[PDB]
Amino acid sequence: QPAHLCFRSFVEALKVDNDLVEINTPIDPNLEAAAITRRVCETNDKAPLFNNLIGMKNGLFRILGAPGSLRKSSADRYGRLARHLALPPTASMREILDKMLSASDMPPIPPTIVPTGPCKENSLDDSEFDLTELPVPLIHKSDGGKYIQTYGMHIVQSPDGTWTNWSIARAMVHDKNHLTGLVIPPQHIWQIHQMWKKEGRSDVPWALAFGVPPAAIMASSMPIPDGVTEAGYVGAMTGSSLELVKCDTNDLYVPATSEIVLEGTLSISETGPDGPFGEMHGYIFPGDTHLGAKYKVNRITYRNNAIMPMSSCGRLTDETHTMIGSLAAAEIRKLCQQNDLPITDAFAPFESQVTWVALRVDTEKLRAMKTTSEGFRKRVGDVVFNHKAGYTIHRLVLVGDDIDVYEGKDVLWAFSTRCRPGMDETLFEDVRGFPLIPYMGHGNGPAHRGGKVVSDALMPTEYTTGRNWEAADFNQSYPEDLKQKVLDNWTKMGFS
Amino acid sequence: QPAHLCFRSFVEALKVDNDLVEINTPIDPNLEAAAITRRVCETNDKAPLFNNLIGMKNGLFRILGAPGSLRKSSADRYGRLARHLALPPTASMREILDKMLSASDMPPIPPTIVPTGPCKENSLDDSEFDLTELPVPLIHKSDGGKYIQTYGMHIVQSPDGTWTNWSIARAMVHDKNHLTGLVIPPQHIWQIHQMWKKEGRSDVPWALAFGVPPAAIMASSMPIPDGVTEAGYVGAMTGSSLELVKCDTNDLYVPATSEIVLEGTLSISETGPDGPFGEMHGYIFPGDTHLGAKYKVNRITYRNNAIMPMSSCGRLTDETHTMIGSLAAAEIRKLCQQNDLPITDAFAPFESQVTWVALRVDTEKLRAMKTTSEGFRKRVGDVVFNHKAGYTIHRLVLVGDDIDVYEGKDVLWAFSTRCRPGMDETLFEDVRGFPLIPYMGHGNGPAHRGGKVVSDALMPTEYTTGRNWEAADFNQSYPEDLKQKVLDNWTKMGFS
Ligand SMILES: Cc1cc2c3c(c1C)C(C)(C)C[C@@H](O)N3c1c(nc(O)[nH]c1=O)N2C[C@H](O)[C@H](O)[C@H](O)COP(=O)(O)O
Ligand SMILES: Cc1cc2c3c(c1C)C(C)(C)C[C@@H](O)N3c1c(nc(O)[nH]c1=O)N2C[C@H](O)[C@H](O)[C@H](O)COP(=O)(O)O
Ligand SMILES: [K+]
Ligand SMILES: [K+]
Ligand SMILES: [K+]
Ligand SMILES: [K+]
Ligand SMILES: [Mn+2]
Ligand SMILES: [Mn+2]
């Protein structure tokens, strides 16, 4: 099958790209695999495939780290993401985000049920597995559990059957047949869990599929709208119906080529300790445990020689930046456009630890609105910060047409030189806040509310008559013929 | 003579370092020399020495561009600055700033008058030069004049003779025997000019020396205290009295080895058009001229084969970032310490276009103060923003002991993840503002007041009991033996 539709083929694509290191000697899942992976992420090296994981028993399991991290080159920087989506490895972030947005005005292509698939090659019942005996990684030294779930897809369905949600939320091993993890508002897993809690009759039928189709894990990490089944959106984006098989112990459906599938329930009544965990913003607060969601596992099915993907998340750059940040920015871009705001592009600068989104403004359109910074700031902020897709984002930076928002250096320059602190910003204190940002959940204020800002880096004439400067750079402060002469003579004169 | 005491020897040091390209074919001072220099600055290439400048007549003049810009390597990144100060080329920013601060608690070493020097090898009276006939560069295409003065040192003395100030302020050619330029508060050239204006009897005796001792041009770009003669501070820092010769037409004294010296007066009554100019923040606003200071030139003296240094300033990275930003940060560091604030280090991140200063806090000391963020923010802000040394800086970022403020990536991470917008910041609206920042002089508010902020990126426990996190990075989230094993096995496993 194609790499974007089959995790095993995606692994073979990374090998063929020379973007994989296969480590066939024993590696310890207690910190070592994640430490290697962490180093890869901090240095944009090749993805590690741990074929010989101390503790692997009866085919459970190998580990692929850094599945959505960056490559060293500028030319194929986003190649690993492109391989999730059947895009060329040289694809730009604009092209990747466009691809992820493309299904938003297509009819869904619902999944196809098939009788069986590779995820059924092996199975373990209630009496044959113990989750504490599998080689689940300890990802960071102070983590409060072994985080089995960093790159699988939780699958839950509304009680009425009309919406089936696929998402990534973390989970750790609690005991032999339970996980715990984060199920928090406004996330769809939480929205669905609320539905089942209000019905009050049963625990939520659940499955967790690891090593799913790469196009599916990307949609899993994207805040597509409420009520939209991710399977049909992936189908539309890929132009192909995804093949799913039914779970053995419940009536949910999992991708046929899933590497590892857990089947069971998410409790509407029980909780258990989760955390702390070394998280996307680059921190772990040791000892910081909180009661979370509790999942019971009834059954494990898996492929022969199953591979568990893993995110060793933290400081720059990993899946939590490349996927959470970029995919939220993509949804925000569309959200603004649908609210008649003249936004052309959006990206979450890595330099901001993906807590900022930069919004590129079509200033011709802005000038026709005949508005002001204060007015426009408030309007953008109300649209974004009151919507789920702005959940993780605490600062919006508005920039004109000259700035490439996919270039953090240019975003920083515009922010630093065009936005007057205070005067050019509007604070938003009565919006939902992202408590995982340390200044929120470990900060001076309410963990779940406020701390958000819109920073206007549009200059005054951008609202009226048009840009009235040229940059003092090589590109803009010298005529074209001169620039060309200088470039043509550069090595001749003696430069690098 | 030594490179830090003689510009001609500094040029020969850059050659010997393989940090110079000598361009011996004709180069046009109308944009081409500055366009080459601009490209060098944007790419951290070797400094260009234009030995064959179209228009050079009777030894006036060659041009050295990018004299204080960055080298490509990390190891000798600041090598060109180190060569200003007799430091090893591998010196750190901490070492350079320490050197620049070292004279602050030394007795001055006043200059030594000598009868003559190289700057007297050639001279031109009132009837033998015309400033419009020299090969003065047009640095950016929309500049409002040919900026002769981008890296020379203005020399003015208080009417009572007790304080002789050396500083860099821009100036452009106005006519055959006059320059115009910026003389603005709170700069010492302005403070002295005010003294002469209030006496009301004569224009200010003035000289402008280009290609001065490299240690002198660094002090020229530093906001050392009011009333302190830069010559004696340089003497103390270098451990040697600087040799000066008297001007021919006035009683000021210039460095003996100055490449080019203009002698004349700064008017207490006349103004003339200055600007626009492509400036440190990365912008030029074409057409934006304002009346500035007017200088009359009575005499030119110069070395045989004189060399004019030039800053082609604008977007990152040039002298306006490496020198204005870093040297203000150095003075701010000391200012805080003298006000009993527990600041260990200060730097102006290049990513902020040197409009921010990051202040590293000794948090052991902070905890003994038993204070709060709001209190501490206000106190730091009042000390810095009400003092000349904070003039150019609009945002202060307070960070704990784990952050290296000389690393912009770590400053950005701390700012983005530890400072809650609004709640963790104090705005300062009744302080002098830096009008050259586009959001000030071309912004929505008063050009000369406010727009400043203190952003507290100290976490709450840093004020009380101590840091309560570990970073989720390779360094902090894995024990030492593991990290070493991983590094030892890195290339063996197959990584880069
Ligand atoms: C790619 C990726 C995304 C997420 C996470 C991770 C990765 C790697 C972890 C490594 C496990 C870290 C963890 O903090 N994590 C995570 C999470 N969302 C949660 O509610 N809870 C979580 O613990 N998201 C983000 C969500 O996947 C997106 O917000 C998505 O939009 C949700 O889907 P939906 O609710 O919109 O359907
Ligand atoms: C290194 C350097 C410093 C400065 C400048 C330049 C360079 C290269 C220009 C390229 C010419 C750009 C110009 O904007 N410029 C400049 C200037 N100060 C001014 O009042 N006016 C100016 O036009 N400074 C900064 C001052 O040199 C420092 O603020 C110094 O502290 C002043 O000395 P003092 O008043 O403290 O004695
Ligand atoms: K999703
Ligand atoms: K603005
Ligand atoms: K000075
Ligand atoms: K803070
Ligand atoms: Mn969803
Ligand atoms: Mn001074």
Author numbering:
A (entry chain A), B (entry chain A): 4 to 499
What do the paper's sentences say?
The UbiD superfamily is composed of a wide variety of (de)carboxylases acting on aromatic, hetero-aromatic, and unsaturated aliphatic acids. Following binding of prFMNreduced and formation of holo-UbiD, the cofactor undergoes oxidation to form the catalytically relevant oxidized prFMN species.
The crystal structure of E277D (1.64 Å) also shows electron density corresponding to partial hydroxylation (∼30%) of the C1′. Additional electron density located close to the C1′ could be representative of further modification of the C1′ at a very low occupancy. Similarly, activity for E277D can be detected by both UV-visible decarboxylation assays and HPLC, with a kcatapp of 1.2 ± 0.2 s−1. An accurate value for Km could not be obtained for this variant, as it does not follow Michaelis–Menten kinetics. Exchange also occurs in the presence of the E277D variant, although much more slowly than observed with the wildtype protein; incubation for 2 h was required for ∼90% conversion.
